[PDB]
């Protein structure tokens, strides 16, 4: 409340490691369906159903420009990433297998990093 703070945690570094697990993020093989954004042009059904897309490239240039204000909103953009993926793909498909890897890949990585 007004003059009564729980201690400083340092954020000085959350900047650089999020870009730094984003990188994992990206080069890691099961990457290739969310490197880019959907094309809303050529996959039906996308535009309407997919509230809010999310793809690496998107949150490399959010985050490149100051658009994350904390690095929670940055975990939300990710997790966006593979609730997206859940919403439009089977479970039992190659994009859908690649979705549950990289949340689980991602949620190591945080885990790890900040908790």
């Known amino acids: 409340s ?16 999020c870009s730094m697990i984003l990188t994992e993020m990206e080069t890691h ?10 094309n809303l ?7 309407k159903v997919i509230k809010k897309p999310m793809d690496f490239s ?3 240039e959010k985050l490149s420009s100051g658009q994350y204000p904390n690095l929670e909103t940055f975990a939300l953009d ?12 089977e479970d039992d498909s190659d994009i859908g297998r ?3 890897n990289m949340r689980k890949y991602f949620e ?8």
């Open 108 to 115: 190591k990585k945080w885990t790890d990093t900040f908790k």
């Open 58 to 60: 998107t949150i490399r």
């Open 29 to 38: 093989e099961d990457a290739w369906p969310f490197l880019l954004p959907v």
């Open 78 to 89: 990710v997790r966006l990433v593979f609730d997206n993926c859940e919403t439009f793909n």
């Open 98 to 100: 690649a979705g549950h």
């Open 2 to 17: 007004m003059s009564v703070k729980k201690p400083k945690r340092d954020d000085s570094k959350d900047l650089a490691l």
């Open 41 to 47: 042009k050529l996959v039906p059904g996308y535009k």
